[PDB]
Amino acid sequence: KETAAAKFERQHMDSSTSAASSSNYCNQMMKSRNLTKDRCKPVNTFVHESLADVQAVCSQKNVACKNGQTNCYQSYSTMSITDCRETGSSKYPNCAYKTTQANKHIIVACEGNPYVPVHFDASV
Ligand SMILES: Cc1cn([C@H]2C[C@H](O)[C@@H](CN3CCCCC3)O2)c(=O)[nH]c1=O
């Protein structure tokens, strides 16, 4: 079974491209990472940095999570990310996404021993 840490890697980690994220990127990635099976997941972010660099965020700037929990952390440096957002014309099972590349600070929720990212909260 998939651990919370593994689910985070599946949903949010893409170290393979630095930031080319073609116009096709989100359409392909949302599908391949199995985020279009139950429904079209409406919003998702992929981070183009090393797993070590993202895991390190759990020891960086402690900030409140959107849900009010205290276990969120903001990266000290900007990171290469791609936001995927479902279009209006997207109809399941043909999930369609707008691909947006940017360089922003990420905010992740961390849990466990080892203390690792388990949720992507925001980018700022
Ligand atoms: C704001 C933001 C959210 N997400 C993901 C994390 C959760 O799976 C989901 C949380 N949230 C649920 C309610 C509002 C829309 C999104 O979206 C994401 O992947 N990147 C983001 O920048």
Swiss-Prot record:
The keyword Signal applies. It catalyses: an [RNA] containing cytidine + H2O = an [RNA]-3'-cytidine-3'-phosphate + a 5'-hydroxy-ribonucleotide-3'-[RNA]; an [RNA] containing uridine + H2O = an [RNA]-3'-uridine-3'-phosphate + a 5'-hydroxy-ribonucleotide-3'-[RNA]. This is Ribonuclease pancreatic. GO terms for molecular function: lyase activity; nucleic acid binding; ribonuclease A activity; RNA nuclease activity. Its EC number is 4.6.1.18. Pancreas. Keywords: Disulfide bond, Endonuclease, Glycation, Glycoprotein, Hydrolase, Lyase, Nuclease, Secreted, Signal. It is found in: Secreted. Endonuclease that catalyzes the cleavage of RNA on the 3' side of pyrimidine nucleotides. Acts on single-stranded and double-stranded RNA. One of its GO terms (biological process) is defense response to Gram-positive bacterium. Interacts with and forms tight 1:1 complexes with RNH1. Dimerization of two such complexes may occur. Interaction with RNH1 inhibits this protein. Monomer. The active site is at H12, H119. Belongs to the pancreatic ribonuclease family. Substrate binds at K7, R10, K41, P42, V43, N44, T45, K66, R85. It comes from the Eukaryota. The gene is RNASE1. GO terms for cellular component: extracellular region. Disulfide bonds join C26-C84, C40-C95, C58-C110, C65-C72. Its main location: secreted.
